[PDB]
Design a protein around this ligand. Sequence first.
Ligand SMILES: CCCCCCCCCCCCCC(=O)SCCNC(=O)CCNC(=O)[C@H](O)C(C)(C)COP(=O)(O)OP(=O)(O)OC[C@H]1O[C@@H](n2cnc3c(N)ncnc32)[C@H](O)[C@@H]1OP(=O)(O)O
Ligand SMILES: COc1cccc(CC(=N)NC(=O)c2ccccc2OC2CCNCC2)c1
Ligand SMILES: [Mg+2]
Length: 374
Amino acid sequence: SYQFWDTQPVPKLGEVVNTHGPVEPDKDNIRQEPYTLPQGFTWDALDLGDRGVLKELYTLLNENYVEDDDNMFRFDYSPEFLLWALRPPGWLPQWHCGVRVVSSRKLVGFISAIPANIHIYDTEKKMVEINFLCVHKKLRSKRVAPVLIREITRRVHLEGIFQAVYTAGVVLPKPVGTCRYWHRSLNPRKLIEVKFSHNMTMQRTMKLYRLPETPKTAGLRPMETKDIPVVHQLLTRYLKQFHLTPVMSQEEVEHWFYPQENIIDTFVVENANGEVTDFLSFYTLPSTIMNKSLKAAYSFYNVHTQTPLLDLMSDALVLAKMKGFDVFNALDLMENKTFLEKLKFGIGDGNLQYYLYNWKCPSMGAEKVGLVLQ
Ligand SMILES: CCCCCCCCCCCCCC(=O)SCCNC(=O)CCNC(=O)[C@H](O)C(C)(C)COP(=O)(O)OP(=O)(O)OC[C@H]1O[C@@H](n2cnc3c(N)ncnc32)[C@H](O)[C@@H]1OP(=O)(O)O
Ligand SMILES: COc1cccc(CC(=N)NC(=O)c2ccccc2OC2CCNCC2)c1
Ligand SMILES: [Mg+2]
């Protein structure tokens, strides 16, 4: 039973869904007053353009955000990463929803929405993406998370949006898809010394996972300003084969792919004709070693039309290694299963569940999920 989630417009777990549409009607009359927090706590919309406020959020998440199943690593999203992730085109200040202690002003809670146009089967809907739900460790198991969720819902409803997309490691009613975490060792000595990885020699293991010093695909180079239109084109066309995807404007494409050091890398393949035919991309997200830092790259969007996908991703691994990353991480979504085993990815523990709020539709396999979040 789900004390919070049974009250929400989402399908029941183990409801075979054969329909397509919203769970409830669009509200045409929205609660104007913030939801009531427990005594001693108050809402505060966080201005991330104020360096002090950004730092406070960084610290909250640094000290209180997601850990792995073994509680040995915690994601360490940087200030600059958070600005990229939370100020894309159409970001709204009121959707950076903090909770503060009244007496001290200490930041103890967060949740965020960013707008996104989502393609789900035969339907394209303006939605939001919910990320960075975080309650301080000392406030855990006090039902603050439902208040954070209800409040962002209200604030999103005020802007005329009635659906959301989100992911979590926990099972809630009801996943649209389920992904699996895969990791590719780049610096196996560090991964073993930090206990990320564990009848093999260390000699043998370094040999197994050794990569070329430079990439193999002809005409690979960083994405530049001039590539924004064609990257947009490649991504728009490539994504049509999946059943859950973003629909990005050209400005959105600039935001999410244009390289920024230690945040996002995108490389394009420009062939012998001067035509851009493929791209790869990965984002930067380290983890604090509890139980100093583990440098990890996360596979983002990888589009292929002329270069085989295996080669693209092989080049992605080489570039990640050149840039000092200890490990390259990917999900089993899109066509990722075609290369994961072949490029010596190992499977992880944990599931990433994909979810829609206020949208009833059939579930899909991971291979039909075409949406990658931060
Ligand atoms: C139209 C617009 C709609 C927009 C809204 C769309 C929905 C957005 C939904 C959110 C998308 C988030 C996307 C991400 O960022 S996923 C990452 C979430 N953050 C973390 O995992 C960081 C570490 N953990 C924490 O900070 C806390 O443990 C959190 C904040 C997770 C829960 O705090 P706490 O441990 O103190 O619990 P509680 O007593 O307050 O509340 C217990 C209730 O909350 C349910 N719960 C637990 N974990 C999650 C979870 N990850 N998504 C949704 N619900 C969750 C739980 O089943 C129970 O409900 P029920 O079992 O009684 O029903
Ligand atoms: C060692 O460092 C850490 C620290 C905390 C948790 C984890 C496990 C984990 N939850 N991984 C992913 O969600 C994940 C795995 C593969 C690819 C992408 C992954 O996550 C994305 C970035 C974080 N939000 C979910 C998507 C590892
Ligand atoms: Mg709580």
